[PDB]
Every structure is written in structure tokens, then in C-alpha cells.
Amino acid sequence: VEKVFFVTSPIYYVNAAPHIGHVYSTLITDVIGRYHRVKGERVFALTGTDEHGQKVAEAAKQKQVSPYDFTTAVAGEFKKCFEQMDYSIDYFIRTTNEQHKAVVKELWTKLEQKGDIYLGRYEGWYSISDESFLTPQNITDGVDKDGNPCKVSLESGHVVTWVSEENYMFRLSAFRERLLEWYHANPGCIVPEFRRREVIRAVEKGLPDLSVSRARATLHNWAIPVPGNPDHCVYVWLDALTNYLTGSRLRVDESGKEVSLVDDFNELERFPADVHVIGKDILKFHAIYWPAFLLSAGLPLPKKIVAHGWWTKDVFDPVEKAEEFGYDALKYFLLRESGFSDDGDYSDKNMIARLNGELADTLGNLVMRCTSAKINVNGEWPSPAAYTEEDESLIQLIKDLPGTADHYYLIPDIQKAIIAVFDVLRAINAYVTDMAPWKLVKTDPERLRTVLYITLEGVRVTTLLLSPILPRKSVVIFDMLGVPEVHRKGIENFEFGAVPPGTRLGPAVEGEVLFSKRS
């Protein structure tokens, strides 16, 4: 299928200012989308804000402001944060958007028409902060904002309240077997594997029907009305999930403004998403509810959901840390340190260790060596002579790197991808140290040609595969190496030897620093 590669992030509640967590989830989305662009693929990356609901309404009230004013303000904060963070997201959707509201009504009507929505009651627990329905097995004892007894969610520890309302119910129970068939027929669809196992376990125990409307008073009328029943408002999560479907049907300005909503998702060739990036805290909504709505509506299911280890929505300001330590470096650190396990050492100490250790010493030092006037005296890419077995062994590593990094990026496990690239980087260092090209300038010019060219090409290819992570710094590196633009993207330039000998390096600004060491 030739289609637009469609990668999304969650859309974040606007009850508070954007923080780390939002920046991480969108960072992952950004990176995946950036990697597919360097492969020369069509990409559409989506991010945005979740603006309706009781949670947000009550946050706006607590600040003595109108919901319209409050969502617009916080959303603007989110837009400023993501711009400052230097992403490359193709569109920023808001659920207050009028074109979005129309897709929600369409989808609602489609589910109703398919027979999958009936009027019933929900009587049970609810976490307003998580906008989540919970069974009694999922709550426990706690304390409110005053030490007063109360019940909280096991999931998140937020206060839960009992709800007894006549609600429109979605027939989630009817989709249990079809979802299990989906999980098993596509064992890559949920990443990492242990979260794929969790979802299956849960669906296997059985599924209750899901409330998809609420009484309009309860939401403070800050919500999308149920089509043909203005007493009710569409559940914030059904509303929220439809974000993905909406964004797949929006034609976008050259300045990121929606200008048109197309009738049919096929028209823009984006739906269904090839990867949903989410945090572990919103797995049920994306891996159970979402495909059930889509199976009901006759729509196509996503290909991959990847749930990382952070808590999506919840001492570290992203922009200030990036001002201190560097943007690409901060992004690199976040991506390198965490797996699907949120047990990352995020201290200033470990940030500096990785900055100095890997960015400055492994990669930075290596770039400076092969470009320096000491070693590379003609400031160009040499023609290599004959390769020795040690030469060939390093070359093999470089030739194998792209296919390996590619598979990691596609899982997606971006940490593993970085580790693979830096293994090759550590090897190239060991080769350089072994060959001592600095001594070779004098002793053996022909030998140097070989060592230097292999060093250049290794640095080029690692840098290319590192470019979705270090997008500003890779441009600097390519500039230093003198790599023509056309060679900076495309799978054509994954191949060893795509930049010809004789290519001149780019001027030198000997106020160096690729990465300046710290503390």
C-alpha cells in the first residue's frame, strides 16, 4: 500500500499547562514521523489538545474563567511549547474545532445506525481526572484534598465518584471475540509485548458495555451534543479518540491551518494510523474502545499502538532544560534513557554523563577528527586504496547498520535504534584509535586515504540514521562533512559509498563545539 504514513500522539487535556510528558509523547511521534521522511516516505504527523469534558470544564471553573477562554489560552500555551521544542508536526488539532465536531456526530450516527448504541444506565465508579469508568475491583481507599476518607482509583490514585445516570451505551461486549481475533492475527499491533499481553488478558476476562453519553448538566454543558438528543453530551473519550479520524480528513494550509474537511478518509490516504503513540495510562481507550468503535463503524483499524513508560498526563521544565543543555541533546537524552519502563535516571548528573560521554566524546570527537586540518589536510573525501580485513570489518558494520536501525525504528523502539547507531560509533572510534590517522599523515599517505574515507562514511551513515533524533545537529554535521543535500535523505543514501570521493568539506568555523562538554 502506497499511503501517507500516519503517526499520531495523544491529544492532551488542557486542564493545566504543558509539561514534560506531553513533550515526551509528542517527541516520540515527531521522531517516528521524521525517520519516515528521511526514507523519502509521505508523512502526516498529528498532535493536539483534548478540550471538552468535565475534567477541563471544572478546571476552567476553578480558575474563574469561561471554558472557551480557558481552552483557547492553554491550547495556545501547548502550541507555543511545541514550537519552541522544534518539532515537525504536520498539524495541531483541537477538539473544539468545528470540523472535528462534525466527524464525531458522523461517527456517532454510524454506530447508532449499525445497532451498537442503546439507551441504558451506568451505575458505578468514575474518575473525573482520568475521564474513566472503573469497576469496584479497580478502586481502593484514599483521601481527598483534605485528609478525609474517600475512594481512589487503583489506576491513578485520583479521587473517584459514584455515578448513576441514564446514558447511551455502546455495545462493547459484542466486540470481545472480534478484538481477540485482531490481537492474535496481528501480534505486532500493540508494543511493547507485555502491554500487548495485558490487553489480551483483560479482553479475555470479558467486556462490559461502555457509556458513551452523559447527562448535559454533569459536564457543565462543555461537550458535543448527542445527535438527536440534546439532553446528552458525547462521552469525552469517544469525542477524543475521533481526533485521529478527523485529522486524517483535514486538508491543511501552508501555515498549519485547517482549510477543508473531506468526505471520505481515502481521499487523503492517511487513515488508519500506522502508529498511535500513547502513554501506558491510556491503553484501554486505544487498544479496546477505539478498535471496537472502528469495527462497528466499518472503518479500518490502526496498524500499531505503542505505549511508552511515562504517565501521559501525570522537577523538569522541558524548555528551560533545553536552553541549558541544548535542544537536540535534551531530545537525545530523553530518547536514550527511557525504555518502556519509565525507570530512567533523569538527574542532571546523568544528563551530563550522556552529553559528555556519548554526544561529545563518541560522536562529537569523531566528527572533529575526520574533518580537522591536522588529519584531513586536503579538506575533502579521499579515494580509498585497498581495504584490509580490519577495514572490511568496520565497513561491514556500517553496511549492516541501516537495516538494523530500520527494524528498530519500525517496531518502534527508538532507544534500541540509538544504541545500535552508537555501537557503530564506538567501533569507528576504536578503529581510528587503532589506526592513528594522525601519525599516518607523515608515514603513509595512501593508507590514510583509506582510514579517512571509511571514517567519513561511517560518520555520515550514523549521522543520517541519527537525524530524526538530532535534527539540527545532523545538519551541522553534514555541513561539516560537505554532504550535498540530496544525499541527506532517501534510502538510496543508506548505502555505503553514496558520497563520492573528491567532495569538499564545508568551511570551518573554528569556534567549534558540536557538543561542548559540561560541569
Q: Which residues bind ligand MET (CB under 6 A)?
A: 10-13, 50, 240-241, 243, 282, 312-313
CB of residue 9 to ligand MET, shortest distance in Å: 8
Write the CB contacts of 132 (distance below 8 Å, at least 6 apart in sequence).
126, 153, 155
Instruction: Please choose, from the candidates 56, 29, 24, the residue with its C-alpha nearest in 3D space to the C-alpha of residue 44.
Output: 29
Burial 142-163 (b: 16+ CB within 10 A, else e): beeeeeeeebbbeebeebbeeb
Residue pair 167/120 in contact by the 8 Å Cβ criterion: yes
Q: What letter represents residue 417's amino acid?
A: A
Tell whether omega for the bond before 484 is within 30 degrees of 0, i.e. cis. Answer: no
Residue pair 90/45 in contact by the 8 Å Cβ criterion: yes
For ligand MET, the closer CB: 286 or 449: 286
The C-alpha angle with vertex 6 and arms to 5 and 11, in degrees rounded to 5, equals 160
CB of residue 178 to ligand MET, shortest distance in Å: 21
CB of residue 19 to ligand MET, shortest distance in Å: 12
Helices 414-435 + 445-465 axis angle, to 10:
170
Please give the residue whose beta carbon sits closest to ligand MET in the complex. Answer: 50
Residue pair 288/175 in contact by the 8 Å Cβ criterion: no
For ligand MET, the closer CB: 26 or 474: 26
The C-alpha angle with vertex 230 and arms to 226 and 236, in degrees rounded to 5, equals 40
CB of residue 95 to ligand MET, shortest distance in Å: 9
CB of residue 409 to ligand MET, shortest distance in Å: 23
For ligand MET, the closer CB: 60 or 240: 240
Q: What letter represents residue 274's amino acid?
A: D
CB of residue 324 to ligand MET, shortest distance in Å: 27
Q: How far is the C-alpha of 180 from the C-alpha of 250, rounded, in Å?
A: 32
For ligand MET, the closer CB: 54 or 243: 243
> Three-state SS across 125-155?
EEECCCCEEECHHHEEEEECCCCCEEEEECC
CB of residue 82 to ligand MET, shortest distance in Å: 15
CB of residue 10 to ligand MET, shortest distance in Å: 4
For ligand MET, the closer CB: 243 or 296: 243
Residue pair 414/31 in contact by the 8 Å Cβ criterion: yes
Name the maximum alpha-carbon separation found in the chain.
Answer: 87
Q: What are phi and psi of 214, to 5 degrees?
A: -135, 165
CB of residue 281 to ligand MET, shortest distance in Å: 7
